[PDB]
Design a protein around this nucleic acid. Structure first.
Ligand SMILES: Nc1ncnc2c1ncn2[C@@H]1O[C@H](COP(=O)(O)OP(=O)(O)OP(=O)(O)O)[C@@H](O)[C@H]1O
Ligand SMILES: Nc1ncnc2c1ncn2[C@@H]1O[C@H](COP(=O)(O)OP(=O)(O)OP(=O)(O)O)[C@@H](O)[C@H]1O
Ligand SMILES: Nc1ncnc2c1ncn2[C@@H]1O[C@H](COP(=O)(O)OP(=O)(O)OP(=O)(O)O)[C@@H](O)[C@H]1O
Ligand SMILES: [Ca+2]
Ligand SMILES: [Ca+2]
Ligand SMILES: [Ca+2]
Ligand SMILES: [Ca+2]
Ligand SMILES: [Ca+2]
Ligand SMILES: [Ca+2]
Lengths: 310, 310, 310
DNA sequence: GGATCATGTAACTGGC
């Protein structure tokens, strides 16, 4: 895991400065080592003469320099992949939902974006031997569509105790794009105390359509969204968590997701879920750096996402 | 219930600013805490130096941060669900129409969308022990199809006095999509004085088809509809009311509702009502985050929506 | 290849000064001969009386003066051009990706910018007879989208041993625009020990959008980007390497790359990759000093970039 | 013993 920022005290930085960084939003040596000098200068008391030291001290602990592709490949092969609850889907994602990267599943209504985010909120608590991620879940909602009774229905399918599952899911609701980005700063706090394995934002773009209405507000909403998606990338790098965000679609004037190019570039995996028949949906890999563009065929059963009981 | 915005006076904000917010459309601390900084800046007198304070003061009263899924589940289990007037329907919706979320029932003509909205306007006044919601009703109409004589016919079935029922239903007619959105701002006013348990918009999209005619006006009508549906979500969150909106259908060129993706995403529950035989209709769950896609079989009797008297 | 800066010791400069230059960022006589007097003065110990000598001594070894266009043309005709993995693309680039110049491929998501950078990371190790570049690869990533399993899939297609290929690719991740420019200084170190044939930055502008947010920060981000792109040009001139950088696009408010004029001028070749159908993309020459503006039609197969298997 | 001037980018539905 990541080293808490209090470790920096043992290096030459007084607690007055460290406690100035924790108030800014840094609760981990990684989060400071990743930050550029410009952000440290931007703190009310962190003078230039300090930030140069803080950065040079933090870089001593974390590896910034190069490495051969072998160490990366060997380390990457040990990355956790949370099971989706569907053998057909994991066969498509080659194991499951990666961690340390941003996955985005978009699709027309009813296609089960919130349902996948609900099983993932549970299976991410399974032991690694069972495909899970061995950690708590973190569910930021922007719709009011968080239904814990759907967490129990899948918790019982996997044998876990419904009591503990509803205790290892930290829920919060965003009421506007400002609160939504603010909950991420409070998220970095909680993520250094307990171990989280999955952070969910559902939906990641639902509030941006309405908070920025005028045609002149469009360039400002994509840039506010860009910082939000970058904040999400910082949590994945620093905490080794798995970020799953949910998008919405729009008609090409056939379905095409919203958010624009800023979200299509930032996302590493895009899953396009369309409805098939009855309760069986069709997930297709829209974008990925390693998976071939293919399709699967999962379902939405009374016990969460599963396979098409045909 | 929600705290009126005058409570904010006891914190450091002068009445000149509070009375500037009430003129904007905020009559509740929640409605201010949910609003983003951008909207407060947009008021004629609320400078940046104030909005940062107003937001930071309002957030002290209402909970914005995280919480475990247990507190949510325990609190969610105590949510009110208004009876539909049909045992078969409540068995489908698992208790009745939820509050604090947007329910949408669409369907071909005659299929009883206005009739369901008429019984709901009455049963939402029943005591909670009888399945109701213990509160007044709020009926925005965009068709002229509000018939109070149908409110009496169901008021007498439930034993309530027809006099009081027609006194606890606040009716208003929208003549265009602008007036329709304007009535919501006057709705937040009335909802903080009295206690409302149900807000109805029938129909929610009937006026959008005609107010925006040209093919180039389509992107502007979906965005005006997006703000309207977001205004509806703010009332459900802030006032804990139950929003029921009515849609229309169109032929796939078999029935498919209008409004597009902006209304399908925003709605949490979509009910598809088709005609069966005689006076018996068939409600089917088109979209929901917790209910399985099933069907029921209600009817339209002389005393409102009921069960198929077979 | 380029002469290491220790060769300058055999001329009249003491090791104290040379070791002062290597700490600055010069590890090659060329890199010193190219540097202006102003930069040498800027070192903590290199007085004016030294820099004039160091420059005049370095210029004795490397050719700075004029030459006829014949020697250049004869020498230019012997420049290496790394194969893209697609016969259709090499026919467009007339042989492949040039070395000693900055190539930039931009395009909407999914269009295979990271995939091209992945095959190029492998084929640049092929012997020159097979179209490669006979050298190691250098992959600076700013997205976390470096997938070594895609390096193996193309390594096996070309018969090379997957073990050695993942040993000749030096990977590093940039977490902000400061670290990104810092990795170039550590790159000049490694490039004088081993022989590199290709340096990759993917993406070259992804971090600049977010690190500089305010409208007033725009003039400072283009200038920080200008130095970065100049650092890239110094590596191409001094080390004879091939620099391939990846850009992102934005909507004209159809696709137009970001970075502004500073990156459009600095780039010598700009390739515009759009999606065609299925797995077949379309690369078009946006800017080049010698190639006509044409298009090709490659693909993204399970073994990397290739030709459209039609 | 004794004063003085100059530049630089960025998305979005609707029957017979
Ligand atoms: N308990 C359940 N058992 C079976 N199916 C269910 C259950 N709860 C919901 N569903 C089904 O799951 C689907 C709802 O999916 P979900 O709520 O994830 O959609 P979504 O992509 O979030 O949509 P939107 O854009 O409207 O928010 C519907 O088909 C619904 O019938
Ligand atoms: N008093 C009544 N007793 C019995 N049935 C009635 C009564 N009033 C209306 N109905 C029936 O209810 C149906 C009308 O339903 P309703 O007005 O809710 O339709 P709707 O979905 O709003 O339609 P539209 O799209 O045309 O507005 C018809 O079948 C009509 O015969
Ligand atoms: N192993 C594979 N086999 C076949 N196709 C693949 C494979 N891995 C990825 N792809 C395809 O390659 C494309 C991804 O391209 P790439 O990752 O290079 O895009 P990009 O230009 O970097 O995008 P972005 O801006 O999102 O980073 C997708 O169409 C994906 O389906
Ligand atoms: Ca949802
Ligand atoms: Ca992407
Ligand atoms: Ca009606
Ligand atoms: Ca919905
Ligand atoms: Ca990429
Ligand atoms: Ca150029």
């Amino acid at each position: 895991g990541p080293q808490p920022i209090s470790r920096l005290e043992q290096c030459g930085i007084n607690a007055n400065d460290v406690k100035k960084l924790e108030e800014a939003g840094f609760h981990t040596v990684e989060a400071v080592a990743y930050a550029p000098k410009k952000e440290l200068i931007n703190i009310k008391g962190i003078s230039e003469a300090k930030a140069d030291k803080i950065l040079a001290e933090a870089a001593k602990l974390v590896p910034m320099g190069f490495t051969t592709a072998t160490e990366f490949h060997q380390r990457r092969s040990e990355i956790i992949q949370i099971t989706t609850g569907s053998k057909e889907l994991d066969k498509l994602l080659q194991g499951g939902i990666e961690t340390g990267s941003i996955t985005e599943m978009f699709g027309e209504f009813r296609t089960g974006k919130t349902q996948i985010c609900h099983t993932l909120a549970v299976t991410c608590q399974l032991p690694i031997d069972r495909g899970g991620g061995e950690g708590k879940a973190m569910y930021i909602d922007t719709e009011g569509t968080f239904r814990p009774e759907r967490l129990l229905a899948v918790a019982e399918r996997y044998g876990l105790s419904g009591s503990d599952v509803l205790d290892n899911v930290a829920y919060a609701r965003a009421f506007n794009t400002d609160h939504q980005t603010q909950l991420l700063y409070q998220a970095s706090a909680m993520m250094v105390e307990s171990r989280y394995a999955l952070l969910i934002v559902d939906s990641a773009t639902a509030l941006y359509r309405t908070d920025y209405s005028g045609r002149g507000e469009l360039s400002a909403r994509q840039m506010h969204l860009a910082r939000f998606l970058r904040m999400l990338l910082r949590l994945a790098d620093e905490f080794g968590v798995a970020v799953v965000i949910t998008n919405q679609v729009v008609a090409q004037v056939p379905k095409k997701p919203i958010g624009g190019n800023i979200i299509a570039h930032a996302s590493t995996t895009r899953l396009y879920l369309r409805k098939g028949r009855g309760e069986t949906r069709i997930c297709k890999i829209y974008d990925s750096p390693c998976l071939p563009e293919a399709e699967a065929m999962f379902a939405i059963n009374a016990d969460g996402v599963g396979d098409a009981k045909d």
